[PDB]
Design a protein around this ligand. Sequence first.
Ligand SMILES: O=C(O)/C=C/C(=O)O
Ligand code: SF4
Ligand code: SF4
Ligand code: SF4
Ligand SMILES: [Fe+3]
Lengths: 51, 53, 118, 825, 630, 69
Amino acid sequence: TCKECRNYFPINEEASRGDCVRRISDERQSYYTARPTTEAAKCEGCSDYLE
Amino acid sequence: STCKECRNYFPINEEASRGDCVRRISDERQSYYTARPTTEAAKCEGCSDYLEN
Amino acid sequence: SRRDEWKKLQEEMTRDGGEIKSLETVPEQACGICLNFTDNAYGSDGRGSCNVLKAGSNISLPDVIITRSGENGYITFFNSDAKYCPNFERMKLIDTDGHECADPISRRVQRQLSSIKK
Amino acid sequence: CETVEELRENQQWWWLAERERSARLDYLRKATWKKGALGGNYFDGIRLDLEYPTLFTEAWKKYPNDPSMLRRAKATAYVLDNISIFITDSAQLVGYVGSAPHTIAWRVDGASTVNSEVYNEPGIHAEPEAESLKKVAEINSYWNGQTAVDKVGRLIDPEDAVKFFSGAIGWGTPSSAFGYSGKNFEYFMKGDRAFSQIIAEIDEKIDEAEEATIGTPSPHILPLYDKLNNWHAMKLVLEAAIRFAGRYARLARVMAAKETDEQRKKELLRVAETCERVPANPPRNLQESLQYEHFVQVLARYEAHEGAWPSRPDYYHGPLYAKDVEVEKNITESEAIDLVGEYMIRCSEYGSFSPRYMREGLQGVTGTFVWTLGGVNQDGTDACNGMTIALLKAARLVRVANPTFGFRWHPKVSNEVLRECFECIRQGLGYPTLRNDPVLIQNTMHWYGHPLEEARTWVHMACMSPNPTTKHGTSPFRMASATMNSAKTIEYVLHNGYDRVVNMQMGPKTGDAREIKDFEDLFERWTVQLKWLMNLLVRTVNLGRFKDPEFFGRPFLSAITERAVEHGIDAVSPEGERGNAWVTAFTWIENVDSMAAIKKLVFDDKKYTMSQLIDALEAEWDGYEQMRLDFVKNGPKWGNDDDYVDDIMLRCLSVAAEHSRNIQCTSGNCWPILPENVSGNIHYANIVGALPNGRRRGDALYDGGVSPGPGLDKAGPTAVLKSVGKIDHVNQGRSFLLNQRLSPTQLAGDKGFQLWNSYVRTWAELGIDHIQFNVISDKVLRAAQNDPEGYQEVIVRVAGYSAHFIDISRKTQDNIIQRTVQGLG
Amino acid sequence: SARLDYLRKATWKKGALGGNYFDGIRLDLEYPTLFTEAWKKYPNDPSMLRRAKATAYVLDNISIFITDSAQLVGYVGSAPHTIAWRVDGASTVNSEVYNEPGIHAEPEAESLKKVAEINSYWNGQTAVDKVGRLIDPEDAVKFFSGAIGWGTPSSAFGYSGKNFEYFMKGDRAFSQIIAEIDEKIDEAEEATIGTPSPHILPLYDKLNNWHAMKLVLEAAIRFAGRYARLARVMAAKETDEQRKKELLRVAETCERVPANPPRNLQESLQYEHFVQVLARYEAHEGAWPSRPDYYHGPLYAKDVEVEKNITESEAIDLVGEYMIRCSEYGSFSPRYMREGTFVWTLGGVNQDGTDACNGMTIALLKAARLVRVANPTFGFRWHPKVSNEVLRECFECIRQGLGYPTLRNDPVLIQNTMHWYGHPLEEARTWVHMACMSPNPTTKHGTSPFRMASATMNSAKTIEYVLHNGYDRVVNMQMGPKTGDAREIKDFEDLFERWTVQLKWLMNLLVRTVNLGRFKDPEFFGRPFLSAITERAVEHGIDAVSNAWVTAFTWIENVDSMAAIKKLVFDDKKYTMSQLIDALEAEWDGYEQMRLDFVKNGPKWGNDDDYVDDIMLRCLSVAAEHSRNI
Amino acid sequence: MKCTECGHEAEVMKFRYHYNPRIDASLSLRQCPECQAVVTVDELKREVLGRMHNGDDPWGKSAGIENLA
Ligand SMILES: O=C(O)/C=C/C(=O)O
Ligand code: SF4
Ligand code: SF4
Ligand code: SF4
Ligand SMILES: [Fe+3]
C-alpha cells in the first residue's frame, strides 16, 4: 500500500495519516507536491509508487 | 382496446380528446361515483374496470 | 461545550437514510423487545431511550462501546439489533395493543412488532 | 319497539335523533367513515391515501428550482387536476380531502417522523400490503431529510430541538404543516369578493409590479420579484381551485345523465350549477354559500393539515339564509335544515394523518372543530338570527360529535336562542359551550390591544382562544403549538429537573429536592422551572413561525387573506398582523394542588418530612398508600371555595401573567396562558410521574383547565363557580376551560331550563368566561363499554371538544365516566 | 539575484496574448472535483455554510506544491502550470470551459468526460442561472441570448475590497479574528437560550454565518500547516545548508502566519499572500487591491533599517519573489472577458496625511526593476511633498519601460472621494485602487466589500434595432421595443429620439439585471472568507456583500454611422432614407458603390470636425444623463 | 401478591399498574405478569380481588348526586 512507498510520510509518529510527497520536474520548473493519504489505502493504480 | 370504447369514459367536449373515467363504487357503508382524468388515447392495459361498448 | 454534546445527541436521533430502508424486519434480539427500552411518546417512528446504557454508547459494531456512567440515556430504535449488547434482556410483558394511549415503558405499537408474541 | 314517545320517555337521544331525521340526512350520516383515532390506531376500514402523496411528490419533483410557495402551488394544482373526486349518492354538497370517502389524507412534507409513523402504522395500507408498503417506503426515501420540521430542528439550538421533540414537555409542531390557521372571513366571505375578484386584484397587482420591474431601475423594485412569484403562486392556486370546482360540476352533470329519478336529477343539476357558480363568483343562495365555504375549507386542508375549523356560520351564511328561507321562501325550512345538517356532516368527514401526540391527544376526532354562534355585530347589537336556530336544530338532528358550537353569550341574547342552546345541551351533544362575550372582548383588547370593533368579530381558533377575523386581527399560524405540560414544572422541582421518561436531564437544576426549607423556596424553584419551560417552547414556536414562509410556504392561505394579497407576502408572515399568540397549559391544576398538599402537610402541619415525600414519589406511592391517601384527603383541593388553595392558584396565575407580559411573539405581542386539557390528560397519563396531589404514574390527569379533579370537590357546583370566579379572566389568562357535568334527570322536563338559566346567570355574574356541560347517564356509558353494537351516536364532551363514546380509548372512557355529577339548585 | 532570475524564468504566464492562453497552461480539474464532491456531501446547509465546508474540504485535500527555490508558498491551483476554474460561477462559463481548446490534459477524452460530468451536475444550479430564473423569462432570454451583451450578474465574478485595517495592522491575525468570532457566537448562543423576543430571531442564521466564517479561517490555518509540513519534509530531504535554512525559515513562517501576527518581513509577506490566495479560492476577484508599502511598512523598517535583522539585498530578493508569486495566479475567464490587471498603490499619505512613503517603496521599485513582471503594475500616489529620491527611483523605473509606476495625482483623487462618497477626511487618505477607475478606502466603514463585474453593453445593436424596428438579423427574435419603421422619419432629431428610446431600454435591461444579481447574491453565492476578513461582517454577523455601472462596447462605430446618416442622407441628400435600409438588409451586397460612398464621405470619428463632434457630444450627453438618473 | 386467576405469587411492584379512576380511594387496575389478565387491586391492603370486566364499576364516585360509592 502506501506504508512501503518511498514518498509516503506520516504526519506524526503516532498518526496513521501521512502526506504523499511527489517530486515532479516540469518543462520549466521542478517542484515538490503533497497530498493527503490515509496510509492504509491501496496503491492500486498508482504510477508514482516507489519501493 | 382503449378508453374510447369503454362505457365509463365521458369526453369533456364533443371535440376534445381529454375525458373523465367515471365509475360507480359500492362500499359496505355507501355507494358513490368517482371521476378521474384520462387522455382517451391511453390503452386499457391492466385496467380491471374496463368495459367495452 | 454543551453544543457539541447536544449536536451529537441530535445527530444520533436523526438516524435516517439506509436505516430507514431497514424497517422491513426486526432482528431476533431487538432494542424494541428489550426490558431496558423506553419508547418515545412524541411519535411512533420507533425512537426511544435506554435506561441502562448512557451517553455515547454503541452496540452496532462487534466491539461494542459500553458507557454506563453518564447523564443522558442511549438513543436506540425499536429495530436496532441487540445481539451484541451485554445488557439486553427480553422483556417479559409486550403489550402490542395499539388501541391504548402511549406507555413508553411496556407498550410497543409498531407494525413490525405486532407479531412478536412473548 | 323504540317508539319516538318511548324514546323521549326513557330519555334516549341518539335513537330518537336517528328516528327524527330525514332519509337523505340518515343516509349521509351513516355513509361517513369515522376518521378518529382509537388510542393511536385509526378505524379498521380506514385506508391511507396513496393518490395524493404520489401525485404531490411527482409534481414536486418536476420543479426543483421554484420557490417553496410557488412550487407548492404548482404541486397542489397538479394534484387538484389529477386527484380522484367523488360524489356520494344523496349528497347536495360536494368536496373532500382525499380520493375516497373511507380514506385519510397524508401530509407528505409535514415531518420525517410522521412519514416513519405512516410506514409503521398497522392496518391503514391497501390489500397488496407488500406493494402499498413498498410505495410508502419509496415516497419516504425521497421525502426523508428535506422536510420543513427537519429544517426547524436543524436550525434551533440543539438542546431546544432535543427537548422539544422528546415528547415529554411539548404538544406541538413548529410549522404550518401541522396545526391550523385563521381564515380572513372579512375578505372572502362578505358577498362582494370571490375567487374571481381576488384573481382580478392579484392580476392588477401583478400588472403594476411587472410595469415597475420592466422600466426604470431603482432599489424599490428589488423586493418586487419575490412578491411577483408569491402573487403568481396565489393566482395559480386560485385558478386551480376554480378548475377543481369545474371538475365536480362536470361529474355532477354526468351523474345527472345517468339518473332515472327526476328529483335526484334536478338536485344533481342544481349541484352542477352551484359548482359552476362558486367559488368563482359570490354566492347567490344558501346552498352556494355553504358550498363556497366548504370548498374554501377543503382547499385549505389540501394545502396543509388544518387540525381546527375556524368559522362563524350564522354570521356569514346568515344573510343568504335569511334571504332564501325567510325573505322570499325559495326553499322551505326543512330543506334548509337538510342543507345545514349535510354541511355539518361534510365537515365531520375530513380526515388526515397526524403525529402520535395529535392522534392520542385528540381521541375520536381528527381535530377540534369549533363553530362560533351568536355574538354581536361590529356595531355591538345582537348578531344572532334564524340561521343560529337552524344550525342548532341541524346539530340536534344529525348528532355529529366533532363539529361543536361555541355560543358567544351576551346579556341581551334572546330567550328563544338560549332555550335552543339548552335543548342542544340537554340532548347530550356537549355543545354549544357558552362563552361570556363581554369579558372575552375585554380580554382580547387587554392582551393584544385589538380595537373594539375588530375584537367583536372574534371566533374560536381551535378550542377556546378568541381570534378576530378582520384584516389585521386574524392569525395565520398555530402559535399555540407552544403547548406545555404544566405538571412537568412541579415534577422537575421534586426531581432536580431530571425526567425519567426520556432518560434525560430536562429542567434546570433549581437545586436538590428533599431539602426545601420553606414554601417560598419551593415556589421560587417552581417559578424558575415554569419560566424555563415557557421560554423554551415560545422560542421554538417563534423560530418556527419566523421560518415557515421559507420552509413550508402557503399559497392558498395567502390567496384568501387581505394582508398577503395586498402586500404580496406569505400569509404566515408577521408583516402587518397583530400577534394574537398564546400558550396552552395542559394539566395546570396539578401544580397548584401539589402546592396545596405540600404547603399543608409538610410546612404547616409537619405531618411528613420532605424526605419521606420525595422517597414516596421515587417509589411512586408503592408501600406509601396511606401516605397517598393522607396527601389526597387532608390536602385542600381546588374547587372547594377554600382560600388556602385559591390564593396559591392566584399567585401562580399572577407570576405566569407577569412572565407572559415579559415575553413577546414574532409580532411583539404577549403570550397569555390558557389552561385546557382536551385529551392530553390521557396522552400524558404515563409521561407525568407521581405528584404530591396523590396521582400515580399511569393515572389520568385532571379533566379540564380549571376544573376540580375527579371527586375532589365536595361543597358543590356553587363552590366551583365561586373558586373559578376569583380568577380575573380579563387579566390573569387568555381563557380558562371549565368542564362540568349535569344530571339528565334534573334537566328533564319543564324546570330543567329554569335551573340551567339560574346556573348561567350565576356563571355570568361571576365573570367566568367559559362553561361546558356534559349530560349523559352512567348506565348508558357502561352499556356502551360492554357492547358498542348500538351506541354509535352517543356523544361525550371531553375537554373543549366532543367525541363519540365508542371511539375514544378505554382509559378515557373510564375517566370521563368518573367525573362528578353536579346537582343544580 | 540568481534566485530572482530562476523564479522569473520558472513562472508560467497566465496572461492572454491575442485573447488566448499560452500552450503550456492547463485547466485544473482537482479543485472542481473536490469542490463538487464536498458540495454533494452537504445538501441541507445554507449557501455560505455549505461553501465554507466545501472550501475547507478542498483546502484539506488539494494538492499543494513548493517550487525548487521558493521562499513564499501558496497557489490557486494544483500545480504551477494549471489555471483556476470557478466551477459554480456561470453555466455559460462552464460550457465555454468545455468548448475551449488547448487547456485539457493528454487524456483529452477522459478529461473532457470529467468536465462534461461536472458541467452536467452544475447545469441549472449555478448562481447566474438562479439570477436568470428570478428575472422575468423574456428578460432572461434576451440577456443570455448574447445579442445585447455579455454579463455575469453574481458575486462569483467581480472585484472584492479587503478590510486591511482590520487584519493587517499587526494587532490581529486569523486566531484573533477567530477569538472575536467565538465571542460573538457565545453571545448569540446566550441570547438564543434567553428571553423569547423578535430581536433574537434573526440571530440563528447569523449564528450559521458566524460558524461558516470561523470554519473558513480554521481551514486556512490548517492549509498553512500543511505547507509547513511539506517544508519540513523538503528540509529533511535536502542537503545544502543555505537551502536548509531557507526551508526551515519557510516552515517557521507558515507556522507563525496566518495563525498569529507576523514578527518579521517574510512572515508579513507570507501572511498577505496567504490572505490573497485564500480569497481567490472563493471567487474570481478580478483585481488585486493590496498596497504593500504601507501595511508591511513597520515590519520591513524594523527588520532592515531599525535593527539590521536581514541584509538589504535579501529584502529586494523577497519582494521580487513576492511579486513573482503574485504573477503566477490566474483563473479562467470568458472569451469576451479574457480580452484584469493587478494594480497596487505606492506612496500616499498616512491616516493623518503626512508622507506615508518609506524605504519599502524604494525596495518595491528596485524589485520590480530587476524582476520585470508585467501584470503587477503599481501606480504611485503623489502628494505635493514627496521626497525627491522616491521620485528619482520612480523615474529610473519608468525609464526601463516596465509601464509602471503610473503616477496618480493624490490630492485631486482624495477630493473626488470626499465629494461623491462623502467619506471622512482621515478615512479617504487610506485608499487603494479597487477598480480601473475606482478608489476604495481600507478602513472599517469606508471599505466597499464587493463591486459587480460591470457587464458589457453592445452600443451598436440599438441603432440596428432602430433602423430595423427592434429586429436583429443575427438572431431571428424581436428584442428591441418596436418604436417605428425606419422608412418613415422626419429629421435626424426624430431619429435621435428613436435611438434614445431604444438605448434607454437597452441600458435599463443591463442595469436591472446587475441590480437584481447584487440584491440576491447573499443567498445565491455566499462569501465566507471575504466576510471573515471584514470588520463589519464579523461584528454584525452578515454576509460581506450585501451602484452598478456597465461598460459600453463598440460605441464609436455607431456614432460614425449616425454622423454619416445625419449629414449624407438629409443634410446633403445624396441618398434617400430607404436605400440605406435596403442596403443594410442585404449587408451591403450588391451596393458596393453605395457602401464605399457611405463610408468615404461619411466622416469617421477623429476628423476634428464640429459636425461629427456634434453627434458625438449629443450621443454621449444623452446617455450621461440617463446614467446619472440610474 | 396472590393473583386470583393463577397462583403466581409475585410482589406488588411486579403487577403492571394500569390506572385508578378514583384518586381518593385505594383500588386500581393491575395486570398479572403471568396470566396477563386485568384485575382489580386494593393498594391499601395489597391484595388482588377479582378480575376486571368491561361493564363492571367497582370504584363508584366519592361525590355527585347520581352514582355514589
Ligand atoms: O392549539 C392549542 O393547543 C389550543 C388552541 C385553542 O385553545 O384555541
Ligand atoms: S506515490 Fe502512490 S503509493 Fe506512494 S505514497 Fe503516494 S499515493 Fe501512496
Ligand atoms: S375504466 Fe379504465 S378503460 Fe374504462 S374509461 Fe376508466 S380508465 Fe379508461
Ligand atoms: S438492547 Fe441494550 S441498548 Fe437496547 S434497550 Fe436493551 S440494554 Fe439498551
Ligand atoms: Fe395471574
